[PDB]
Design a protein around this nucleic acid. Structure first.
Ligand SMILES: Nc1ncnc2c1ncn2[C@@H]1O[C@H](CSCC[C@H](N)C(=O)O)[C@@H](O)[C@H]1O
Ligand SMILES: [Mg+2]
Length: 779
RNA sequence: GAUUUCUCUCUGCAAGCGAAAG
RNA sequence: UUCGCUUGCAGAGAGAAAUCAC
């Protein structure tokens, strides 16, 4: 385990080197002088680390988090990688161990917070000769110092736990100065000074029972509930020992911790210690199959599965009631299909799907998560996921145990990752077996989700009818085998509102699963000896059709938008002019295309109310006017509302307003018309807004049948034509209609309407509401 | 227990890119 | 304007790890 974060390293040298995050830019965005707008792009970071002497700085970084490491990275490479490089000399681990123990049985330590303190303190309360003796297993387990050292002296400790006990004893013998090995554990040589212990008893901060499990090594034997009792006068281990038949707790062994996700409590497996490492007839005991699986360590003889231990600033014992069904849960919790079931809270109801749709059609824990959780509990390294332009590898201690690669490259980081993670999970699921006839009592598409309410009961095939798994609401992906098959086939017939039921004479649920779900296990065990059937009762609550991925497509050969620009460009060259206005210049596409070709225009102007849009445009104009601007001499962009008059724009010859009107109110459309024609006097004006009747063709793949979630309205060819001509006549303009898209002949009409207002006739004050956000004039 | 590191998910927000019935 | 993709920031929630005055 080398996760050596430069950061933690600094914690070893006190909170003396302060970090400061500073935000700087990397010129990764277009440089545009003069713009009064601000495109707040991602800023990169670099960290400041003030260590006593000198201070170090990280160079540019994308992640605030990476930089802080980077500062610690440059702080330690300048020192000589002095803290990371330090590792243990084998014999030096014995010194740590030795010196550590010595400190533990020292006077002062007796009143320490560290779990040991309660253990050591508790050891004084042990009856008879057992007094003052802490059991070996505790000196090795509770304290990680001993473990970190023990691991270095021997990795074989992980597989064989009795080894840490022998190293503990041997270190105790070499340092016999205040440590005496007793048939009852380790004990101090001399009495704790009377005052220290009295001082201790004054401040103590004061018959409980903790149900656990009893695991036999004899396969035939049943695993049963064995409730152990803890008393303030006896170390909890003696209580466990007492149940395994032994005489001391000094005999008790302790496995690593496990099963938090499976059972919900931190567990240990207490078994006995072959008298060989203790004295440090001779008939070793039978290996305990079950016990060994659960904890991933080899254990002998019977064992006790329990969740007990001392916490920190407390003398109080912490525990949880492990029960018979906690045990079965822990097993099912080892397979991936099982982990999924437990994570989903419906073991008999769910199943680990075989395929991945979209992260919106899935249900329960992601293949990736349930995978990583799987490896860590399995004594393995986080799975390495390879993305190419998917390939997932499994690593455990430098050894490769699984390598996978999926053929389809879904268009998403997560999705390709999740699909590979399922294949992997299916494989491991093949190592432990999991995944009959039916009778019934009272059209759905793959890629849909059903919300059922199901109820399961175990009873004798006809005090015998007992509920096992109930559930009010759960959603299931349909067609990915994400639920028990019988319930799936049953449901795909049902329609919303129905309650169907059926039973399995031969229970389809592997008993380990039935036992994992059911609380009164004693009654469940009985029913399983006689003909037991499993009753399913489903009520359908809702459904949701197939997924929606196919979202966008190109319909018109040249894309609609460009034809619209082209069309308006034709009018600009056909009638030659000077000044042009762009009421609603999005990001400058009209102006983009317009400055790509030598056009007899003199000065351009864009007006828009969108700051995010005016920014993209000014940058484009900056680059476009740099190539030889064939004819322009004063480009300008105003952040303003076209529904407003600004004296700065006068003498407009050509006037563009490409489909903006439809983006505002129907009166705002009229008011805009009114002002543009009357106040600005454009010699020519081009307005576009799509023909509404066309939307019926595009649907084939405020109002119904609308294009944007922004359009306030949409017009028919007759609606537009009317508004258009009313405004025209009332202001002396010549109006002609045409569109882009299809053609004026084919009945649908044009896909987008266009009205060309022409001044036939060919009262002002100053007010500058707008705000010049960008300007430019050849000098 | 103090502290701290690293992850993943959720929602919020910003930006870059691409496209379109804008 | 609108949608989709990618990345950075904040907050919340779950999870793993490590050190702690001899
Ligand atoms: N009242 C108003 N004043 C000015 N601009 C407006 C406005 N209401 C909407 N707009 C602008 O109208 C634009 C509509 S979409 C832009 C289409 C443009 N013809 C192109 O093809 O690039 C948006 O950029 C929006 O900011
Ligand atoms: Mg529009």
């Amino acid at each position: 385990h080398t996760p050596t974060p430069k950061a933690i390293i600094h914690q070893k040298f006190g909170a003396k080197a302060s970090y400061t995050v500073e935000e700087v830019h990397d010129s990764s965005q277009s440089g545009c002088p003069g713009l009064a707008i601000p495109q707040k792009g991602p800023c990169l970071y670099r960290c400041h680390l003030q260590l006593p002497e000198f201070s170090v700085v990280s160079n540019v970084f994308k992640k605030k988090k990476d930089s802080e490491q980077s500062a610690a990275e440059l702080a330690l490479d300048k020192l000589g990688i002095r803290p990371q490089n330090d590792d243990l000399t084998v014999d030096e681990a014995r010194d740590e161990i030795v010196g550590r123990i010595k400190y533990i049985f020292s006077d002062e330590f007796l009143s320490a917070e560290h779990p040991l303190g309660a253990h050591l303190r508790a050891a004084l309360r042990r009856d008879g000769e057992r007094c003052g003796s802490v059991p070996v297993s505790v000196i090795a387990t509770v304290d990680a110092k001993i473990n970190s050292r023990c691991k270095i002296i021997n990795p074989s400790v992980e597989s064989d736990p009795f080894l840490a006990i022998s190293y503990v004893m041997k270190a105790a013998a070499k340092l016999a100065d205040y440590i005496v090995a007793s048939p009852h554990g380790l004990r101090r040589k001399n009495a704790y000074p009377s005052e220290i212990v009295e001082a201790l008893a004054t401040h103590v901060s004061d018959s409980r029972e903790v149900a656990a499990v009893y695991i036999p090594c004899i396969d035939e034997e049943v695993v049963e509930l064995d409730t152990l009792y803890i008393s303030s006068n006896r170390h909890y281990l003696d209580s466990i020992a007492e149940r395994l038949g032994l005489k001391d707790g000094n005999q008790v062994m302790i496995s690593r911790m496990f099963g938090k996700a499976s059972c919900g409590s931190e567990c240990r497996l207490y078994s006995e210690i072959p008298k060989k490492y203790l004295d440090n007839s001779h008939i070793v005991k039978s290996r305990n199959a079950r016990a060994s699986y659960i904890c991933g360590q080899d254990i002998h003889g019977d064992a006790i599965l329990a969740s007990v231990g001392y916490r920190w600033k407390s003398d109080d014992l912490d525990y949880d009631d492990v029960t018979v069904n906690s045990f079965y849960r822990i097993c099912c919790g080892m397979s991936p299909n099982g982990i999924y079931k437990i994570s989903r809270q419906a073991v008999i109801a769910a199943q680990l799907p075989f395929a991945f749709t979209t992260k919106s059609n899935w249900r329960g824990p992601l293949p990736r998560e349930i995978l990583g959780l799987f490896c860590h509990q399995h004594r393995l390294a986080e799975p390495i996921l390879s993305s190419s332009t998917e390939v997932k590898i499994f690593t455990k201690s430098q050894d490769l145990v699984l390598e996978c690669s999926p053929r389809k490259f879904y268009e998403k980081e997560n999705d390709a990752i999740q699909n590979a993670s399922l294949k992997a999970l299916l494989w491991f699921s093949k190592f432990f077996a999991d995944l009959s006839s039916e009778s019934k009592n009272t059209s759905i598409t793959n890629g849909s989700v059903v919300s059922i309410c199901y109820s399961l009961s175990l009873a004798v095939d006809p005090s015998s009818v007992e509920p096992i798994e109930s559930n009010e609401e759960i959603e299931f992906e349909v067609g990915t085998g994400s639920m028990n098959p019988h319930i799936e086939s049953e449901v795909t017939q049902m329609t919303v509102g129905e309650y169907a039921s059926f039973k399995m004479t031969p229970p389809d649920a592997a008993e380990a699963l039935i036992l994992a779900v059911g609380s009164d296990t004693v009654r469940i065990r009985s029913l399983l000896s006689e003909r037991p059937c499993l009753n399913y009762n489903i009520l359908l609550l809702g459904v949701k059709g197939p997924s929606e991925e196919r979202m966008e497509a190109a319909f018109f050969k040249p894309p609609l938008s460009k034809q619209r620009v082209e069309y308006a460009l034709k009018h600009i060259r056909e009638s030659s002019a000077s000044t042009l206005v762009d009421f609603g210049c999005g990001s400058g596409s009209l102006l983009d295309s317009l400055l790509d070709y030598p056009t007899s225009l003199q000065t351009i102007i864009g007006v828009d109310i969108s700051p995010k849009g005016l920014a993209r445009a000014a940058k484009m104009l900056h680059v476009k006017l740099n190539k030889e601007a064939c004819n322009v001499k004063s480009a300008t962009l105003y952040d303003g509302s076209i529904l407003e008059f600004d004296s700065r724009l006068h003498d407009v010859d050509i006037g563009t307003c490409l489909e903006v009107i439809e983006h505002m109110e129907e009166d705002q459309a009229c008011e805009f018309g009114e002002k543009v024609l009357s106040l600005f006097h454009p010699k020519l004006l081009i307005v576009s807004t799509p023909n509404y009747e066309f939307n019926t063709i595009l649907q084939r793949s405020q109002l119904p049948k609308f294009r944007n979630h922004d359009h306030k309205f949409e017009w028919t060819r007759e609606q537009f034509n009317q508004w258009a001509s009313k405004l025209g006549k009332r202001h002396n303009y010549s109006v002609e209609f045409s569109g882009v898209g299809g053609s004026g002949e084919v009945e649908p009409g044009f896909a987008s309407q266009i009205a060309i207002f022409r001044r036939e006739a060919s009262a002002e004050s100053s007010m500058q509401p707008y705000k010049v956000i960008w300007e430019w004039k050849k000098e």
